[PDB]
Each structure stands twice: as C-alpha cells, then as structure tokens.
Amino acid sequence: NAMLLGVNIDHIAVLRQARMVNDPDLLEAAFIVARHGDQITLHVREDRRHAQDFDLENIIKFCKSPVNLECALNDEILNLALKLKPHRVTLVPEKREELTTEGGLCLNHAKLKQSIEKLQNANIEVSLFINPSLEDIEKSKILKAQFIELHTGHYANLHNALFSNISHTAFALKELDQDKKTLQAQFEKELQNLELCAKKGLELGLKVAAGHGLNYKNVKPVVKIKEICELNIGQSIVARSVFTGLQNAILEMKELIKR
Amino acid sequence: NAMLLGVNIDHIAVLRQARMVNDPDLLEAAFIVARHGDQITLHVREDRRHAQDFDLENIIKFCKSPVNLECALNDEILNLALKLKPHRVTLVPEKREELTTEGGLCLNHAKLKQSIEKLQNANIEVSLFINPSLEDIEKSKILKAQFIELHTGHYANLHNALFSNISHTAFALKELDQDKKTLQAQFEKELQNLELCAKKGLELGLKVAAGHGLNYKNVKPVVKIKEICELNIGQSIVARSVFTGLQNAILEMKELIKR
Ligand code: PXP
Ligand code: PXP
C-alpha cells in the first residue's frame, strides 16, 4: 500500500502575498506539485490570506493532477467549489462555529450535512478534517464522508518538543513546558490513538488521510500506520524547499513515506 | 569592479513567522548567505514582523560574513545595534516621521544626525537608504554617511510593468495603468537618473549601493552602472529559492551581476 502525498501549496502563496509582486508564482509551483506529488492541495480561506479564487481556477484549468480544495462552511467558497469542481473538497474549520478546541471540524455544525450533500451531488469527493476521536470517526461515517483526515497537529508538536531543539527557542509552546516523562507518555498515547483511529476508519469503509504539522522527522512513525493511505503536507515542504528547491523537497518526502 | 551582493534574509524569516515552528531556520539560511553572498542583510523592524533581536544576535555570533542591519530611528533598535555592533547599519524609514513619499529616508529627520554620530562613534559603518535625487545625495554627504543605498523600487515596478506579465494579474499596480509610451519614457528617465545619482555619489566620495525590487530580469541594466558597487537583494532571491534552493538562487544572481 504505497502512501500518497498531497502537497499543500498554501505557504508558497504566503510568500507571494508578502510582497504582492506575483513571485513566487503559485501556478509554477503547482506544475511541480502536479508532476512529483499525488495531489495538489490548497486552502482558499474566506479572508483570502494566502491562496486566492484565481489560484483555484488556474490550477484546475492548467494542472495535470487531482486537486484538493480545503475550505470552510461559508456559501461563497462552497459555491466556488460547486462552480469549478475540484476533485476533492476537504472541509476544515475557519470560524468559531466550525471549530473544536483541538482543531478538527465540529461535526455537529448545522450546515455540515447539507454542505456534504451539495458537494457529493456535484460529484466532488468529500473529506472531513477531524480530531482523532473514535466518536468523530463514527459521525463522519454517518455523514457519508468518503474520506476523513486525521489532525496530526498535537502529535507533531509533541514530537517536536521531545526530539528537536524547539523548547530552547522563542518558538517553544508554553503548554508543552512539562517534564519529559509526561510528554513521552502523551506522545505514545497520541501515536497509539492515531493508529487506532486509522484502523477504525478503515473498518467503516472510510479512506483515511492525515495532516497538520508533519515534517521530515515526525512523519516517520506515521508512515508505519498501514491504514493511513495519504498524508497532506505543506509547511514543512515549503520550508525545506528554501534550501533544496521544491522538486527535491517533494522527492525527499516521497522517499520517507515509502513502505 | 566586481559587484558585491548583500542578501537580505527577511523573507525567509517571513516564512518562519508564518507558522512559528522555527522552520525555515534563519541561522541555517544565514550560513548559506555567509558562504555564497558578500554580506548578510536583515531588517529588525520595531514591530518585529519578521527578523528578530535573537536573529541579529545569532548571526553576529555565528556567521562568517559581514552583517548589515537595516533599522529605523527608534532608540530600542539603535541601542541593540550599539550593543551587538553589526559591521554596517543601513538607516531606513519605518514610521511616518522617517518616511518620504517615494520611500527613501527623510534626511531632515530630527534624530538622524545624532543617530549617525552614535553609530560611527561605535565604529559601525553607516549607510543611508535614499531616494535617487541629487539633493538627497548631497545631504547624505553632509551627514557624513560612508554609504548611500539608492532606492530601485520605482525602477523595478516600471521594469516589471513593461517586460513581464504583471499588468495582466491581480498584482497589477493601478498607478502604472498608463500607456506603454509614457511608461517607457518614465522607465528610461528612472534608469538614467539611477546612473546620474551613482556617479554623483562616487564624485563625492560615497560608496554607492542599490536595492528594493531587484529581480533576475530587472537587475541587468542596473549592473551596467559602473559606479554602483553593491546590490542588496532579498525578496526575489527567496522567491527563486523555492524553486532552486537558496545556494543556487544566490549563485544565479552572482552570475548575473558579473561585469
Ligand atoms: C486539512 C489539512 N491537511 C493538511 C494541511 C497541511 O498542514 P501543514 O502545512 O502543517 O503540513 C492543512 C493546512 O493547515 C490542512 O488544513
Ligand atoms: C535598504 C534596503 N535595501 C534592500 C532591500 C531588499 O529589497 P528586496 O527584498 O525588494 O530585494 C531592502 C528590504 O526591503 C531594504 O530595506
């Protein structure tokens, strides 16, 4: 079961929007992802912080790759999805009403069920970005999602605190200022839980993806979870690309997820 | 007269601050600049938008390269310069009181003369980032600057409008929505003026640098201005690095500025 790699190009658009001179060119970057990744992912936020409507249009029109649009439950972006028809839509929280404390989508949101229906009626694959809880997995099955994407964010931060220098830097997370034994127990639980949730997802006929915070060090134990078929990774790849170029950054990640 | 290249690493720090996970690592990037550039430039803004105090400290402590700190006329950053002693300080506007309409430093600012004195008293080289006007060049000589850095920002935007696709994109500048002939006349004047100002600077014993907006296409006519000894370039290099890696991005630029 070869793992698939979705490359989220949001942070290339972050750089672009930082100077407003169309450099880096997101479509150039998308051509490289189309060739060396398995899908192109982007999040067109309601506030248009990074990726834009025209980016989604351009990528759909020009790139030889499946497209995964991440978006929230606002009508404007949903309608855009319905108009342009990316291959897949991954529903993610942006507003408070969509959020949970842990960062996955609130699966009780009033608009969620109809949103899913609208998308599937338009023949768009639907993925729900969720906390790794057995309850959220079972609800996702009930809501008729084809995919779920497990939030690896807490796992990633734990891995970083334990096996890198991040706690000695200005980027240290105050919440992870606890003794190593407690951190190590939480890390093991979090990884165990990701595996349990993937198995549950697979048992219910869902396709299981994982994403948020994955990097070239913390990805390695996630690859060993046989039941995860796809990782969606952005920020760490774009951060590596500053040193190696995007092609090599993607190819390096592909080598790590071989199994 | 081989042209020197200062690499401004601000936009690598922009990426880092976008996710707050110490990736990309600015010190890693600074090691690459130290090796392949001629100086490392960074702007520690009062608002700490990108580069941080600890970045200046780390680079000064660890990197085998001259350091050029860009900063404004606030006491906090000046004191930091005085404490850490980069090789050079380039005084740039951040607040309204420091600004001119065109983007160079206001050379009448009340604190400017004393700021220059404080820095030179500490044996820090001082550069003034200025509009390309003969008047600002003569004042910079009077203020006893060792360097001036000509603002190539208007030149760059003109070049982009004329010789790239930028006017057909969402990044088009409304002010440059004018007919090609007027743009072409303004472009020629702007380039002529940059040359005139460099010659004037050199005539007065100033060292002449140039920066803002320079990229792999618009740099080429600037290299032909014999009297400019140094270019300071950031955003275009970091934008290229996403595709080629920072080493190759720097080396590519170095090849273009050979003369
Ligand atoms: C649902 C989802 N998956 C994966 C990613 C990629 O995450 P990262 O940039 O941390 O790798 C994102 C972007 O935050 C996302 O929203
Ligand atoms: C004085 C000065 N020179 C050069 C640069 C580099 O400019 P750019 O990032 O547009 O190449 C900057 C950063 O805006 C600067 O402040």
Side-chain angles (χ1 to χ4, degrees), chain B residues 48-63:
Chain B
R48 305 301 194 263
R49 166 187 306 187
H50 42 52
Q52 310 291 312
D53 298 12
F54 62 76
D55 290 319
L56 177 66
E57 177 168 327
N58 290 340
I59 292 156
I60 287 173
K61 171 159 187 199
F62 290 101
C63 295

Side-chain angles (χ1 to χ4, degrees), chain A residues 11 14-25 28-29 32 54 166 169-171 235 239 241-243 245-246, chain B residues 11 14-25 28-29 32 54 166 169-171 235 239 241-243 245-246:
Chain A
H11 286 246
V14 167
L15 262 185
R16 184 189 59 197
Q17 298 305 107
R19 184 62 71 75
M20 300 300 186
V21 291
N22 196 216
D23 197 14
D25 183 325
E28 260 180 321
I32 294 170
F54 62 76
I166 192 106
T169 73
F171 304 92
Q235 195 280 331
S241 80
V242 165
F243 299 87
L246 183 59
Chain B
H11 286 246
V14 167
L15 262 185
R16 184 189 59 197
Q17 298 305 107
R19 184 62 71 75
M20 300 300 186
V21 291
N22 196 216
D23 197 14
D25 183 325
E28 260 180 321
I32 294 170
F54 62 76
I166 192 106
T169 73
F171 304 92
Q235 195 280 331
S241 80
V242 165
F243 299 87
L246 183 59

Side-chain angles (χ1 to χ4, degrees), chain A residues 177-193:
Chain A
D177 189 23
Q178 302 179 73
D179 85 306
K180 220 220 212 154
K181 282 191 277 248
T182 307
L183 291 178
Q184 180 60 51
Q186 293 175 36
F187 173 71
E188 280 165 29
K189 191 250 173 171
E190 195 75 18
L191 177 56
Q192 202 154 149
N193 188 64

Side-chain angles (χ1 to χ4, degrees), chain A residues 8 70 90 92 129 149 211-214 232-235, chain B residues 19:
Chain A
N8 184 316
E70 300 174 9
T90 300
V92 303
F129 180 69
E149 185 175 340
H212 273 227
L214 297 177
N232 283 281
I233 303 179
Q235 195 280 331
Chain B
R19 184 62 71 75

